[PDB]
């Protein structure tokens, strides 16, 4: 007899550039399976190449069914970050939580429900869902009422050279505990630029963010990867445009924060 710690089986919805898996591997947690629902070919490719296939790419969220869930084996971790667009107080055209991409949220909800252990099964089950802090009070509420919980605002400002305040709903252990800097964690925007360039601000959020050898310029992509905490040249795949690439990193997860968030998983699953 012996109840050994086993590898983690995860389900990432709106996976993006697989920050989830990236960080999971970072913490040294063995991953049995990483099933991602992504529809953007660009991000899909990134994940495909950076994690050498390991990611089983399902398709559009709303093409995943309860039948698929239990068939896709039981899941230990469910993470996701539905598109912020129609929830952003800044985007006037926003169609709120019920229309546009706003709806996509319930897709996460629906699937969360189809995966969480049914009453009786005490199996360990963790889940996490992110979204922009700057959203309508009603939406924040409804989301809270759907996921049956309140979020946890947390800004990557405290652990990275950028200002990313995002809401976090979930049952991961110690989500409220204060964050911590690491010996390795570029917090100064200067500590992100490449050689020969000087930073104006201490943290990005106020136009072109850096000056260079007598010229005023925009942030480079290597640097932006470095600003969210991605390895350098991490998004150097495909022949996508600077604009594309940007859009990638642009709307991703601050690696430092998911490390912070995931960190306490190390004690519940097999380790590499």
């Amino acid at each position: 007899p012996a109840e050994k710690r086993k590898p983690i089986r995860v389900l990432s919805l709106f996976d993006g550039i697989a920050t989830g898996l990236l960080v999971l591997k970072d913490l040294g947690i063995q991953v049995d399976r990483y099933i991602a629902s992504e529809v953007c070919e660009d991000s899909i490719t990134v994940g495909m190449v950076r994690h050498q296939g390991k990611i089983m790419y399902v398709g559009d969220v709303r093409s995943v069914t309860q039948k698929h869930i239990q068939e896709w084996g039981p899941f230990d971790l469910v993470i996701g970050g539905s598109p912020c667009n129609d929830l952003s107080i800044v985007n006037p055209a926003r169609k709120g939580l019920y229309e546009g991409t706003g709806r996509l949220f319930f897709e996460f909800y629906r699937l969360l429900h189809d995966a969480r252990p049914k009453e009786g099964d005490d199996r360990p089950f963790f889940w996490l869902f992110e979204n922009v802090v700057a959203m309508g009070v009603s939406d924040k509420r409804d989301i809270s009422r759907f996921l049956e919980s309140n979020p946890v605002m947390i800004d990557a400002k405290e652990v990275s050279a950028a200002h990313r305040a995002r809401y976090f709903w979930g049952n991961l252990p110690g989500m409220n505990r204060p964050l911590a800097s690491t010996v390795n964690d570029k917090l100064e925007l200067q500590e992100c630029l490449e050689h020969g360039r000087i930073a104006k601000f201490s943290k990005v959020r106020q136009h072109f963010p850096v000056f260079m050898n007598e010229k005023e310029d925009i942030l480079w992509c290597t640097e932006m990867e470095r600003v969210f905490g991605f390895p350098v040249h991490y998004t150097d795949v495909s022949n996508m445009s600077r604009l594309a690439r940007q859009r990638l990193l642009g709307r991703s997860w601050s690696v430092p924060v998911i490390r912070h968030l995931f960190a306490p998983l190390k004690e519940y699953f097999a380790c590499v």
Partner: protein, 186 residues
């Protein structure tokens, strides 16, 4: 597939109606004689609420009548419905028969329809009403799909609704198969 129940062991049915009550039309079938709990705005209704409201055998909810009697994007009803519907389910060891039904009064787009169907796990079953001078349904109540009329068109149906903006009996007979599971009164 719900295993039928003998007559001497069928108690009164507990019904939870959302967005509209059937307290009347459901009595008309001899299902009532309360056993039915009605709720309008579910906004803040939490899980414990739906539980302390006593167990339910039938969860009903339907979109508002064509006219915009209330302000709240269509989907809302569906999503919210699915929410409480889940809080209302039984335990794993299915005690007795449990049924639910969501009805749409031609108010959901063809977009909102795919959501609704994909969310309630089944295509709806449209039942019309003709007269010459004068609704979609989702549910797991027996033989509700063999009563589908693959006749009425969408284009026409769209015309029906568009004309109602510029200006019961249907489902009442869907509850009959429930007569075989719960107590009939007088």
């Amino acid at each position: 597939m719900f295993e039928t129940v003998p007559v001497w062991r069928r108690q009164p049915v507990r019904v939870l109606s959302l967005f509209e009550d059937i307290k009347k039309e459901l009595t008309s079938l001899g299902f009532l004689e309360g056993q039915l709990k009605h709720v309008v705005d579910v906004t803040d209704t939490v899980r414990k609420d739906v539980e302390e409201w006593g167990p339910f055998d039938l969860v009903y909810g339907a979109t508002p009548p064509l006219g915009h009697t209330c302000d709240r994007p269509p989907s809302w009803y569906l999503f919210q419905f699915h929410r409480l519907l889940q809080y209302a389910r039984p335990k794993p060891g299915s005690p007795r028969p449990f049924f639910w039904m969501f009805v749409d009064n031609l108010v959901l787009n063809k977009e909102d329809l795919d959501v609704a169907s994909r969310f309630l796990e089944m295509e709806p079953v449209t039942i019309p009403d003709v007269h010459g001078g004068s609704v979609r349904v989702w549910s797991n109540i027996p033989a509700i799909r063999s009563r589908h009329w693959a006749l009425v068109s969408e284009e026409e149906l769209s015309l029906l609704a568009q004309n109602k903006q510029s200006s019961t009996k249907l489902v009442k007979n869907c509850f009959l198969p429930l007569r075989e599971y719960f107590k009939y009164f007088s």
